[PDB]
Amino acid sequence: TQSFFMRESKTLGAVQIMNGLFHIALGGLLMIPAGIYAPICVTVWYPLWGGIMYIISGSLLAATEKNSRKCLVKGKMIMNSLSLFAAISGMILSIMDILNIKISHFLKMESLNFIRAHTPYINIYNCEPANPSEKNSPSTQYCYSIQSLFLGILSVMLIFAFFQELVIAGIVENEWKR
Amino acid sequence: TQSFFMRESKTLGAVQIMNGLFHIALGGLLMIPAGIYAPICVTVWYPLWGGIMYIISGSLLAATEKNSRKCLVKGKMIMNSLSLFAAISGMILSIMDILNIKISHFLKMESLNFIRAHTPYINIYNCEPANPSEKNSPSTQYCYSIQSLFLGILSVMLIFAFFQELVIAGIVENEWKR
Amino acid sequence: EIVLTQSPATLSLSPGERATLSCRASQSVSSYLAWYQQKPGQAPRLLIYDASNRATGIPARFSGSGSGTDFTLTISSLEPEDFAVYYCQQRSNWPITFGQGTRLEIKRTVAAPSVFIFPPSDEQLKSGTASVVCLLNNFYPREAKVQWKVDNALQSGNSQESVTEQDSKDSTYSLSSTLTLSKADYEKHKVYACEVTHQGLSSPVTKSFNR
Amino acid sequence: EIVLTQSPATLSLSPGERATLSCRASQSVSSYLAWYQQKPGQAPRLLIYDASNRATGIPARFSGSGSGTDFTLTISSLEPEDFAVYYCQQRSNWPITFGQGTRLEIKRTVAAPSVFIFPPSDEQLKSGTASVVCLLNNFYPREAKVQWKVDNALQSGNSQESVTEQDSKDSTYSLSSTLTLSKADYEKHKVYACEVTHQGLSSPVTKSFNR
Numbered sequence: 001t002q003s004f005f006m007r008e009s010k011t012l013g014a015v016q017i018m019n020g021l022f023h024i025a026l027g028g029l030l031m032i033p034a035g036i037y038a039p040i041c042v043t044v045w046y047p048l049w050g051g052i053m054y055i056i057s058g059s060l061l062a063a064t065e066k067n068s069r070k071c072l073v074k075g076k077m078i079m080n081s082l083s084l085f086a087a088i089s090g091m092i093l094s095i096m097d098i099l100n101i102k103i104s105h106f107l108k109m110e111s112l113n114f115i116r117a118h119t120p121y122i123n124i125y126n127c128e129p130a131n132p133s134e135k136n137s138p139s140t141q142y143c144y145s146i147q148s149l150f151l152g153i154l155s156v157m158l159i160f161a162f163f164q165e166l167v168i169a170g171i172v173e174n175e176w177k178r
Numbered sequence: 179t180q181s182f183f184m185r186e187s188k189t190l191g192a193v194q195i196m197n198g199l200f201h202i203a204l205g206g207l208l209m210i211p212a213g214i215y216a217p218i219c220v221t222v223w224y225p226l227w228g229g230i231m232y233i234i235s236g237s238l239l240a241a242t243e244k245n246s247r248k249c250l251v252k253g254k255m256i257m258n259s260l261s262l263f264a265a266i267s268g269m270i271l272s273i274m275d276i277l278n279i280k281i282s283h284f285l286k287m288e289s290l291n292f293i294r295a296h297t298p299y300i301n302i303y304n305c306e307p308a309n310p311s312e313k314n315s316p317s318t319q320y321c322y323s324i325q326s327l328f329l330g331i332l333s334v335m336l337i338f339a340f341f342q343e344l345v346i347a348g349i350v351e352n353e354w355k356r
Numbered sequence: 357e358i359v360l361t362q363s364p365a366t367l368s369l370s371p372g373e374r375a376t377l378s379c380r381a382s383q384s385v386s387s388y389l390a391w392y393q394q395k396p397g398q399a400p401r402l403l404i405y406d407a408s409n410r411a412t413g414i415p416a417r418f419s420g421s422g423s424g425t426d427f428t429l430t431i432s433s434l435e436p437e438d439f440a441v442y443y444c445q446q447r448s449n450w451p452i453t454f455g456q457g458t459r460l461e462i463k464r465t466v467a468a469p470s471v472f473i474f475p476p477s478d479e480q481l482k483s484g485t486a487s488v489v490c491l492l493n494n495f496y497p498r499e500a501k502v503q504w505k506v507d508n509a510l511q512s513g514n515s516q517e518s519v520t521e522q523d524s525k526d527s528t529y530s531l532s533s534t535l536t537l538s539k540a541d542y543e544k545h546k547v548y549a550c551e552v553t554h555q556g557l558s559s560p561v562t563k564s565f566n567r
Numbered sequence: 568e569i570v571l572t573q574s575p576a577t578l579s580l581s582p583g584e585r586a587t588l589s590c591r592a593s594q595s596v597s598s599y600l601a602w603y604q605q606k607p608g609q610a611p612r613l614l615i616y617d618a619s620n621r622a623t624g625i626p627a628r629f630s631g632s633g634s635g636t637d638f639t640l641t642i643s644s645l646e647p648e649d650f651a652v653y654y655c656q657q658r659s660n661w662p663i664t665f666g667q668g669t670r671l672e673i674k675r676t677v678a679a680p681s682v683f684i685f686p687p688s689d690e691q692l693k694s695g696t697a698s699v700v701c702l703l704n705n706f707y708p709r710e711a712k713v714q715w716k717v718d719n720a721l722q723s724g725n726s727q728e729s730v731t732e733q734d735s736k737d738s739t740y741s742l743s744s745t746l747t748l749s750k751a752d753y754e755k756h757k758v759y760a761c762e763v764t765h766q767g768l769s770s771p772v773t774k775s776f777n778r
């Protein structure tokens with residue numbers, strides 16, 4: 001409840017633009033052709049409007065001093081509330097797709113046809129050799145490698161999304177005393 | 179040559195701590211077991227160098243106001259010089275690994291033994307069916323996902339290293355007029 | 357490669373509660389197994405897989421588990437549709453090997469068998485063959501010792517016989533020994549007879565007819 | 568599946584500059600090809616691959632390219648170690664098919680052949696066989712028409728012959744027709760002779776001996 005960040009709030013909104021840039025860059029980098037059943041990050045298009053929202057929030061603090069009325073003094077509340085809502089949706093999707101990977105199939109999430117035709121003869125959710133022998137096969141090894149890579153990138157996205165939500169929650173609790 | 183960032187340089191150094199955080203996070207993420215011959219960035223341990231050099235600079239710019247002597251005012255030139263040299267090496271290695279990936283073998287960069295035992299049976303530099311037929315086989319068309327992932331990781335690494343070098347060059351040029 | 361051995365079939369199961377069999381293997385198979393239920397007249401049905409999970413969509417009162425080379429399964433409920441063959445398989449190394457089959461019985465009391473004779477007919481012999489049939493019915497169990505003798509002499513490698521199924525009322529077994537015989541051998545032989553022995557008779561009995 | 572046909576061998580190559588052969592295929596093969604150099608007495612050596620890149624570590628004065636079904640290669644330099652067989656292969660679809668072989672010659676002038684006779688020996692006939700040899704030497708080219716007649720009668724399917732290599736001085740070919748013959752047939756026959764024809768003779772010549 002200690003107020004010590006209001007006077008040094010120039011950087012808090014200054015970093016958000018490049019936070020959104022990083023988020024949208026990661027979302028774009030995650031759009032590599034993988035297989036048939038794309039993850040939940042595809043069917044919702046969350047990274048696109050999430051990064052747009054973050055960069056708009058960062059650019060909102062371009063002029064902290066009072067310049068105009070009803071545009072730089074009234075939007076500060078709706079914008080932070082919607083940013084917090086986007087953040088909580090971010091945690092919901094992140095926890096769901098971090099819990100659904102180590103357990104069996106839950107939902108479908110079909111990928112679009114333009115990228116599906118590139119790699120239509122493989123699956124990403126499960127790959128079993130269907131034989132107790134030949135366990136030391138390149139197919140299973142490559143599956144384990146790519147699954148570990150996907151898990152790592154998802155964990156990285158989780159950690160930085162959580163940090164972004166923490167700073168957004170701090171900045172939104174700065175304005176109002178509940 | 180127009181000096182307009184000196185008075186508002188707090189953000190420029192503020193973003194550097196978490197830029198180094200991004201650098202070290204990417205370095206840790208890229209260290210998943212992937213193939214037999216590790217890339218050049220593995221044996222050089224560059225991400226640790228970049229992260230440490232960036233975080234120590236961020237710690238240096240914690241207090242801009244004159245507080246002590248010979249510690250917060252003398253190292254501002256050695257720090258900038260070492261950061262610039264580290265960035266120079268950064269994009270030198272970046273261009274090296276982005277040029278050696280589409281051309282034939284140049285060097286080996288043999289990986290360490292602890293990761294060696296886990297992934298013995300797959301190559302990362304080149305996968306070929308070794309047969310003119312069976313082109314539409316998983317073992318042939320099922321490398322391009324990680325190929326594009328590595329290409330994108332290297333590209334974003336190069337872009338962010340270039341941006342960091344640009345901002346550091348601007349900062350050091352602000353200090354001294356050449 | 358891998359060969360599977362099964363418990364002996366035709367197990368005498370009184371109408372009680374206990375029912376247990378086994379399926380062993382020579383080489384140490386993996387932990388996971390598979391048991392299936394086979395019924396005649398239509399497609400078979402799944403029974404249990406991995407010896408740790410129940411059936412999907414079918415209620416299962418069975419209890420089967422085990423590890424290594426010895427496995428035990430037991431069923432306590434008595435339903436009128438469980439009397440069928442049992443198959444055990446393995447999936448340790450390709451190619452896989454299948455079992456032979458164990459069929460359960462109903463514990464029916466023994467019945468006194470009967471005999472009959474039938475000399476060859478004129479139309480039968482005019483075709484170029486002569487067959488004599490001895491009818492066996494109302495006997496238990498299906499195992500029996502029936503042979504043929506001609507002129508007090510023993511012949512082998514000439515009899516083909518098939519068994520019947522069990523009725524839904526009394527589960528009565530029937531048999532009919534039939535041998536195709538040549539005309540030339542039929543002409544030069546005098547005495548034809550068939551002999552049957554069973555637990556229901558204290559002394560062998562034979563029937564003879566005049567040609 | 569894929570079958571490869573080659574240009575006819577024994578091509579007459581005068582000591583000039585031009586030297587060209589071909590290797591065709593029935594089905595349309597892929598663009599990439601492979602040509603190899605084979606030498607007798609030791610391991611062969613690479614010649615050219617993909618019809619677009621030179622040899623690795625070996626200087627190459629050759630010029631071979633082509634596409635589709637027709638391919639052309641030409642060599643202008645004349646070295647004393649290029650006289651060998653040529654092999655063409657393909658790698659379009661498994662299994663691969665190999666060629667037969669084309670060997671180049673030296674353009675040696677024709678030489679007059681000679682003939683000889685040799686009656687069977689006492690030690691030879693005592694073993695249980697009798698062979699007569701007609702020696703052929705100093706003839707060009709290797710192709711020749713030699714046959715045997717006994718008592719002015721023609722026999723077939725009894726002659727086995729092998730050819731020799733070429734010397735490093737004059738490249739002279741030699742032949743020696745030898746047929747193993749039974750004693751019983753040797754006793755009852757009168758006249759043995761062998762006949763040879765060639766471009767160097769204007770009329771067939773034969774030699775006979777008294778038994």
Ligand SMILES: CC(C)CCC[C@@H](C)[C@H]1CC[C@H]2[C@@H]3CC=C4C[C@@H](OC(=O)CCC(=O)O)CC[C@]4(C)[C@H]3CC[C@]12C
Binds near residue numbers: 027028029031032118
């Ligand atoms: C605003 C943008 C920057 C957000 C990020 C979008 C990219 C992550 C996606 C959008 C379309 C995708 C592209 C769609 C198609 C291809 C074709 C693909 O090569 C092909 O398949 C050739 C075309 C064919 O053979 O059909 C290379 C990847 C690429 C460029 C994809 C790369 C990733 C792209 C650019």
Ligand SMILES: CC(C)CCC[C@@H](C)[C@H]1CC[C@H]2[C@@H]3CC=C4C[C@@H](OC(=O)CCC(=O)O)CC[C@]4(C)[C@H]3CC[C@]12C
Binds near residue numbers: 021022329330
């Ligand atoms: C906030 C944004 C503007 C920062 C920049 C992000 C993108 C504009 C850049 C970053 C890395 C670039 C990617 C680097 C590598 C590739 C690989 C490339 O793959 C191929 O074309 C080869 C296909 C194959 O044959 O495998 C597709 C484009 C892509 C994703 C590039 C798309 C554009 C990306 C995502």
